[PDB]
Ligand binder design. Structure first.
Ligand code: FAD
Ligand code: FES
Lengths: 457, 113
């Protein structure tokens, strides 16, 4: 029989789940996972908050997959740069793009470049050890911080900003960020959304965590939930409980115990509705951000292309830190692959890249940056399946295929030294040791050149 | 395994197996090496919904009281029924022997948007 050679571009949840599916449903298929970072797992390592270790458990299943004899890892290989997609298509039977959505949604407003304005995801990569963000060194000396957008990512940075530093002591949070967080004078966090309460993008788990965060109290305006009760009682299961928790918190008087807790709280988080960022207001010396001008908006223009539009009235909000968490978009990495700049994804029909035989995709680069790990997982399985289905039907390149035998020699000729999964395990073991002393799960290596020095690279 | 449990996989196929009382169905699944597409991703820590299972009515009624922590993850699960529970939260009992749990399939493409 044929021995399928499959290539996966990206080592995050979508790439590892697609490979997992391929290995499980085809006994001879081989999967080579390429990754531009020196280490695997993508956002499970760099995105998921350090106080959410339970979620990082999917890493155990990816490690199991990577250890399979029919799987190989190739970190420090940036597809489209070190190796082109066309070159991978020549080497493999099928190529699956799973490189997530890297680009951040710019605010595109006056003063969005003022110091103190960061991408919410840059702040996250900061404390999660993404190398490119290790020198973010955000100024946490100001009292208020404003987060634009009301998704889970917003709740994550707002939670990390208000969590008592000591409670983060033994998580895998970078020691660097934990040190900064200890000196932080941030005590007020506002999460502002363009739309209303019925449109919040976060889930009940993360909201509940926020409502119960030690040392904090919630700041919800009862007026934002007026004539909204009956619509909540009719919402769908996923939505109902979430909304009822917000409504309850926003309109019901807390018990004696809860009230006492809040009266004692020293930090606070709140939710603002119907406000779109109009401009970041500068400080007296115009050297930093001192606040943000929010335009009051209205639900106007409804239907498919529904959007909030400024009424003309504004509101200036004092704040020393402004975090933009308004989604993201994938980016094209190779001129050989089609791209939908409007939706920010690689055009595809349920996994099949448009007009490119043998080319597939999964994860955020396929559906957009709106799914948790479980969503990405079941989506990635569907792609692995449509690929196996094309294989059986004979719609993928016939015969031979050298796979890595070709790419290895190619990357070699180009002076690119790949990081294998076993090399990663030496690094992993090192980070775990450094976590021993301080009692943390690990102490992430942030210096690119040191990580390579370890591996002997 | 002192008791028997039947798992109706997504592809119609049934996977019978035994698991000693006290174990969560995730334990029954994992240790018995049952092939259920991405079942128990967070390894039973209430961080996912991949261990979602549809129990028999005559058994659902007498299961441990469901917590908010479980409902929080269950709301994000597809193929949700009135007899749904997170498998890793249900520890086996003597009265569960020979029961039949069904892994949710159907059209979940709706969760991908
Ligand atoms: C701040 C934050 C917190 C989150 N918290 C949670 C949570 O608590 N629970 C949850 O379930 N989900 C959470 N998620 C969502 C989860 O991280 C995503 O659903 C998941 O990472 C999607 O996987 P992916 O495979 O599409 O892409 P990603 O994980 O982004 O991985 C894409 C991979 O491709 C690599 N890559 C990019 N370009 C190239 C290239 N040219 N060549 C080679 N490799 C390349 C990237 O470096 C990366 O490793 C969170 C997301 C964020 C941003
Ligand atoms: S295995 Fe994750 S919640 Fe049950």
């Amino acid at each position: 029989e044929q021995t399928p050679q499959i290539c996966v571009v990206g080592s995050g949840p979508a790439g590892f789940y697609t490979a997992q599916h391929l290995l499980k449903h085809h006994s001879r298929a081989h999967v080579d996972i390429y990754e531009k970072q020196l280490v695997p797992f993508g956002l499970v390592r760099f995105g998921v908050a350090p106080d959410h270790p339970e979620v990082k458990n999917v890493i155990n299943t990816f490690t199991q997959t990577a250890r399979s004899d029919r799987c190989a890892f190739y970190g420090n290989v940036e597809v489209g740069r070190d190796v082109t997609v066309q070159e991978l298509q020549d080497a493999y039977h099928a190529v699956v793009l799973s490189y997530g959505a890297e680009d951040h949604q710019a605010l595109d407003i006056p003063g969005e470049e003022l110091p103190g304005v960061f991408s919410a995801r840059a702040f996250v990569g900061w404390y999660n050890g993404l190398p490119e963000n290790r020198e973010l060194a955000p100024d946490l000396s100001c009292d208020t911080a404003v987060i634009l957008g009301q998704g889970n990512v917003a709740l994550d940075v707002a939670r990390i900003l208000l969590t008592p530093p000591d409670h983060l002591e033994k998580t895998d949070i970078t020691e660097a960020a934990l040190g900064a967080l200890r000196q932080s004078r941030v005590k007020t966090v506002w999460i502002v959304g363009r739309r209303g309460p019925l449109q919040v993008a976060f889930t009940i788990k993360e909201l509940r965590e926020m409502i119960q965060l030690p040392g904090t109290r919630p700041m919800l305006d009862p007026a934002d939930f007026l004539g909204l009760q009956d619509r909540i009682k009719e919402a769908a299961r996923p939505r109902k409980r979430l909304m009822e928790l917000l409504l309850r918190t926003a309109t019901e008087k807390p018990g004696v115990e809860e009230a006492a807790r809040r009266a004692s709280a020293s930090r606070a988080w709140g939710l603002r509705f119907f406000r779109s960022p109009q401009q970041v207001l500068p400080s007296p010396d115009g050297r930093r951000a001192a606040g943000i001008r929010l335009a009051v908006t209205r639900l106007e223009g409804i239907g498919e292309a529904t959007r909030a539009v400024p009424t003309g009235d504004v509101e200036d909000l004092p704040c020393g830190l402004v975090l933009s968490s308004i989604g993201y978009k994938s980016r094209p990495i190779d001129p050989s692959v089609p791209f939908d700049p409007k939706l920010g994804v690689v055009p595809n029909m349920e996994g099949r890249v448009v007009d490119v035989p043998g080319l597939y995709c999964s994860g955020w680069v396929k559906r957009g940056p709106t799914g948790v790990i479980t969503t990405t997982m079941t989506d990635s399985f569907l792609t692995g399946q449509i690929l196996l289905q094309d294989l059986k039907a004979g719609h993928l390149p016939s015969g031979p295929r050298p796979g890595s035998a070709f790419i290895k020699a190619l990357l070699d000729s180009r002076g690119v030294w790949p990081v294998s999964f076993s090399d990663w395990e030496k690094l992993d073991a090192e980070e775990v040791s450094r976590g021993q002393a301080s009692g943390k799960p690990r102490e992430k290596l942030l210096d690119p050149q040191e990580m390579l020095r370890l591996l002997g690279h | 395994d002192k008791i028997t449990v039947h798992f109706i996989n997504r592809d119609g196929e049934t996977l019978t197996t035994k698991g000693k009382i006290g174990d969560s169905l995730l334990d029954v699944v994992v240790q018995n090496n049952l092939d259920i597409d991405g079942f128990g991703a967070c390894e039973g820590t209430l961080a996912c919904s991949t261990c979602h299972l549809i129990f028999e009515q005559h058994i659902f009624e007498k299961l441990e009281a469901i917590t908010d922590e479980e409902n929080d993850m269950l709301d994000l699960a597809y193929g949700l029924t009135d007899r749904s529970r997170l498998g890793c939260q249900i520890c086996l009992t003597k009265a569960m022997d020979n029961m039949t749990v069904r892994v949710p399939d159907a059209v979940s493409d709706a969760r991908e948007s």
